[PDB]
Curated annotation (Swiss-Prot):
Ca(2+) 1 binds at residues 19, 94, 96. GO terms for molecular function: calcium ion binding; collagen binding; core promoter sequence-specific DNA binding; endopeptidase activity; metalloendopeptidase activity; sequence-specific DNA binding; serine-type endopeptidase activity; zinc ion binding. It comes from the Eukaryota. May be involved in tissue injury and remodeling. Has significant elastolytic activity. Can accept large and small amino acids at the P1' site, but has a preference for leucine. Aromatic or hydrophobic residues are preferred at the P1 site, with small hydrophobic residues (preferably alanine) occupying P3. This is Macrophage metalloelastase. Its main location: secreted. The conserved cysteine present in the cysteine-switch motif binds the catalytic zinc ion, thus inhibiting the enzyme. The dissociation of the cysteine from the zinc ion upon the activation-peptide release activates the enzyme.
């Protein structure tokens, strides 16, 4: 499967969910990228305006890419694997209620999962792994990437 053929990868937050304050969204996404940068040689750089590899979008229902979202619950988000254009981009279902902690869908955790997909990872069968198909919550201070996630991502980048 595809991998980015560079280690310096940019992202841009196309739009901001009204569920959270902007600073919280920025922080959530930043920390999510940091998860993966902590165990690879990849470096991620935030762009406010202009060209970026990984676009982050909040949208609902059908939103232009042939993979419609399905309203509150069910599918929370999705992301395309490495490549130009839509490649890498990560979309979040706005019909979820995105949150800094629990009491909705935790953005940080979901973003960790999607960025995993953005980087070219598939799913784990290990429920401890962030790349497991279904969402779970833990506090960010308690969160750890599983050995399977680390094995996965290091198999692609190192
Ligand atoms: C039999 C079976 N079935 C059924 C049943 C039913 C039953 C019952 C009912 C009831 N009850 C009784 C009791 C119960 C209790 C409770 O509550 N419980 C619950 C319920 C049960 O159910 C069962 C089921 O199973 C279980 C399991 O589950 C789990 C959960 C899950 N999750 C999920 O899903 C999420 C969502 C959430 C929300 O909501 O929000 N999601 C997710 O996750 C997703 C999924 C996907 C898939 O698919 O896989 N995912 C996603 O999105 C992705 C993204 C992401 C990821 C993430 C993450 C991950 C991970 C993580 C982690 C890891 C590790 C660690 C940590 Cl810390 C973390 C993180 C994160 N993020 O993000 C996506 P992606 O991958 O990117 C993608 C995309 C795209 C593509 Br192409 C690719 C890829 C009862 C009782 C009681 C009651 C009451 S009272 O008052 O009495 O209390 C009341 C009531 S009411 O409502 O009336 O008021 C009620 C009640 C009750 C009841 C009734 C509820 C049913 C459901 C019926 C069914 C069945 C079967 C089948 C079926 C069908 S079919 O077709 O299949 O056949 C269908 C149907 S329908 O309806 O839909 O049509 C149905 C059914
Ligand atoms: Br997709
Ligand atoms: Ca949904
Ligand atoms: Ca892209
Ligand atoms: Ca929302
Ligand atoms: Zn989409
Ligand atoms: Zn997934």
């Amino acid at each position: 499967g595809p991998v980015w053929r560079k280690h310096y990868i940019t992202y841009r937050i196309n739009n901001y969910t009204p569920d959270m304050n902007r600073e919280d969204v920025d922080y959530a996404i930043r920390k999510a990228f940091q998860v993966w940068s902590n165990v690879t040689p990849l470096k991620f750089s935030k762009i406010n305006t202009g060209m970026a590899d990984i676009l982050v979008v909040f949208a609902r229902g059908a939103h232009g890419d042939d993979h419609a979202f399905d309203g509150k619950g069910g599918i929370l988000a999705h992301a395309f694997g490495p490549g130009s254009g839509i490649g890498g981009d990560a979309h979040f279902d706005e019909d979820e209620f995105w949150t800094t902690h629990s009491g909705g869908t935790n953005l940080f955790l979901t973003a960790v999962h999607e960025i995993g997909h953005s980087l070219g990872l598939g799913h784990s069968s290990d429920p401890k792994a962030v790349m497991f198909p279904t969402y779970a919550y833990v506090d960010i201070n308690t969160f750890r990437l599983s050995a399977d996630d680390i094995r996965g991502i290091q198999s692609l980048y190192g």
